[PDB]
Enzyme design. Sequence first.
Site, mmCIF file in Angstrom:
data_model
loop_
_atom_site.group_PDB
_atom_site.id
_atom_site.type_symbol
_atom_site.label_atom_id
_atom_site.label_comp_id
_atom_site.label_asym_id
_atom_site.label_seq_id
_atom_site.Cartn_x
_atom_site.Cartn_y
_atom_site.Cartn_z
ATOM 1 N N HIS A 1 0.827 -1.197 0.000
ATOM 2 C CA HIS A 1 0.000 0.000 0.000
ATOM 3 C C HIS A 1 0.872 1.262 0.000
ATOM 4 C CE1 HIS A 1 -3.205 -2.819 0.819
ATOM 5 N NE2 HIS A 1 -2.582 -3.223 1.913
ATOM 6 N N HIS B 1 5.224 6.962 6.937
ATOM 7 C CA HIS B 1 4.979 6.491 5.584
ATOM 8 C C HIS B 1 4.535 7.684 4.737
ATOM 9 C CE1 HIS B 1 0.978 6.206 7.567
ATOM 10 N NE2 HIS B 1 0.530 6.526 6.375
ATOM 11 N N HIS C 1 1.978 9.016 1.200
ATOM 12 C CA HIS C 1 0.967 8.863 0.167
ATOM 13 C C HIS C 1 1.359 9.788 -0.987
ATOM 14 C CE1 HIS C 1 -1.699 6.738 3.088
ATOM 15 N NE2 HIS C 1 -1.233 7.608 3.972
ATOM 16 N N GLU D 1 -3.570 13.696 0.901
ATOM 17 C CA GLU D 1 -4.808 13.139 1.407
ATOM 18 C C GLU D 1 -5.651 14.298 1.908
ATOM 19 O OE1 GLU D 1 -4.034 9.570 3.925
ATOM 20 O OE2 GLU D 1 -4.554 8.697 1.983
ATOM 21 N N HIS E 1 3.133 11.014 6.792
ATOM 22 C CA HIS E 1 2.412 10.730 8.024
ATOM 23 C C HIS E 1 3.382 10.129 9.041
ATOM 24 C CE1 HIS E 1 -1.773 10.489 5.848
ATOM 25 N NE2 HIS E 1 -1.361 11.714 6.069
ATOM 26 N N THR F 1 -6.544 6.598 7.701
ATOM 27 C CA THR F 1 -6.966 6.820 6.337
ATOM 28 C C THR F 1 -6.855 5.547 5.518
ATOM 29 O OG1 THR F 1 -4.804 7.393 5.459
ATOM 30 C CG2 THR F 1 -6.169 9.188 6.465
ATOM 31 N N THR F 2 -6.386 4.464 6.150
ATOM 32 C CA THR F 2 -6.465 3.141 5.550
ATOM 33 C C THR F 2 -7.312 2.250 6.449
ATOM 34 O OG1 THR F 2 -4.368 2.382 6.483
ATOM 35 C CG2 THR F 2 -4.278 3.380 4.292
HETATM 36 N N1 LIG Z 1 -2.607 6.728 6.922
HETATM 37 S S1 LIG Z 1 -2.618 6.845 8.515
HETATM 38 O O1 LIG Z 1 -3.904 7.366 8.869
HETATM 39 O O2 LIG Z 1 -1.466 7.582 8.916
HETATM 40 C C1 LIG Z 1 -2.519 5.248 9.238
HETATM 41 C C2 LIG Z 1 -1.716 5.071 10.348
HETATM 42 C C3 LIG Z 1 -1.655 3.837 10.957
HETATM 43 C C4 LIG Z 1 -2.414 2.777 10.467
HETATM 44 N N2 LIG Z 1 -2.328 1.534 11.094
HETATM 45 C C5 LIG Z 1 -1.775 1.296 12.419
HETATM 46 C C6 LIG Z 1 -0.340 0.826 12.381
HETATM 47 C C7 LIG Z 1 0.336 0.528 13.552
HETATM 48 C C8 LIG Z 1 1.638 0.058 13.513
HETATM 49 C C9 LIG Z 1 2.316 -0.121 12.307
HETATM 50 B B1 LIG Z 1 3.787 -0.643 12.261
HETATM 51 O O3 LIG Z 1 4.322 -0.995 11.070
HETATM 52 O O4 LIG Z 1 4.516 -0.786 13.389
HETATM 53 C C10 LIG Z 1 1.619 0.164 11.136
HETATM 54 C C11 LIG Z 1 0.308 0.613 11.172
HETATM 55 C C12 LIG Z 1 -3.237 2.974 9.360
HETATM 56 C C13 LIG Z 1 -3.299 4.209 8.747
HETATM 57 ZN ZN LIG Z 2 -0.987 7.654 6.008
#
Ligand SMILES: NS(=O)(=O)c1ccc(NCc2ccc(B(O)O)cc2)cc1
Ligand SMILES: [Zn+2]
EC number: 4.2.1.1
Length: 262
Positions: A66, A96, A98, A108, A121, A200-201
Site C-alpha cells: 500500500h 509512511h 501517500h 490526502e 504521516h 486513512t487506511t
Molecule cells: N494513513 S494513517 O492514517 O497515517 C494510518 C496510520 C496507521 C495505520 N495503522 C496502524 C499501524 C500501527 C503500527 C504499524 B507498524 O508498522 O509498526 C503500522 C500501522 C493505518 C493508517
Molecule cells: Zn498515512
Amino acid sequence: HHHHHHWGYGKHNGPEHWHKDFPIAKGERQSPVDIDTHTAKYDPSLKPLSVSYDQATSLRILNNGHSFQVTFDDSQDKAVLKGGPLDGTYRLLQFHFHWGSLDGQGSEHTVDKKKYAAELHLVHWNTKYGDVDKALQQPDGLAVLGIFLKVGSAKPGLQKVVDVLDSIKTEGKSADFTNFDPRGLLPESLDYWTYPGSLTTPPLAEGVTWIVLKEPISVSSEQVLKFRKLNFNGEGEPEELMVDNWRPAQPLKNRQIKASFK
Ligand SMILES: NS(=O)(=O)c1ccc(NCc2ccc(B(O)O)cc2)cc1
Ligand SMILES: [Zn+2]
Ligand code: NI
C-alpha cells in the site's frame, strides 16, 4: 437481521468501496478532510507542538503493498510528540507517505481544496496505553503528524530514504535502515491545524488526533519519481506502479478544525 463481518486503491477495491468491509467509513470522524481556512477557528489555547526526536532509532524500511514505511524503536521515549492539542506523550512508531501518479495530486488532506503532490504521516501512539496494540483500541490512542509535499527544491534529509527505494521495489520487501533522522523531514514552521479523525487506511478506526502542518516541505521531481518506481505488486507478478495511494477528503460533518496560528 443482517449480520456483518483485500482492499487497495484500484477501481474495484479502492476508497469508494471500503465502507462495505469497514462500515466505520459511514461515521462522523473519518479522515482525511479538506481544511477550509475561513472556517478553521484559530484557537490561542493551542500550544506549540513539541516535536522531541532527540534520540530517534530507525530500524527497518519496507514495502507493505500500500505504501513504504520506516519503523522506529518505540520501546522507550526515544522519539515523542507532546504539546499542541495532545494530552500526554505520544511515541513515534513509523512514518509512511501517500503520493500521486503526477505532481498535481498525492496529498490526502487538502487545504481550501488544493491537493499537494504527496503527504507524509508520522504515526505516534499514546504512551499511557502501554503499546500500540492497546492504544489502537482507544479514542485518544493515536496521533498522526501530517506534512505536505510539493515539487521543486530537493529535500536533503529524504535522500537517505530515496537512495534505498530500489531495494524494496516489490510488495513484502524490507531492509535495515538505521540512523535515519526524522527531523530532516520537518519544515521550518510547526504551525498546525488539528481535528479528531481516523486512520486513512482500513480499518479506518476513529481514534486519531490529526496534526497537519501548514508549511509543506519541498522535494525534487527526481525524488518523487523514485516514489513512483515502487510496485503495489510482488516480485514475479505483473507490474503495477505504486501511485495514487491516497484516500480522498471525507466530510467534516459536526467537527471543527482548529488552528494554532492566526
Ligand atoms: N494513513 S494513517 O492514517 O497515517 C494510518 C496510520 C496507521 C495505520 N495503522 C496502524 C499501524 C500501527 C503500527 C504499524 B507498524 O508498522 O509498526 C503500522 C500501522 C493505518 C493508517
Ligand atoms: Zn498515512
Ligand atoms: Ni445477531
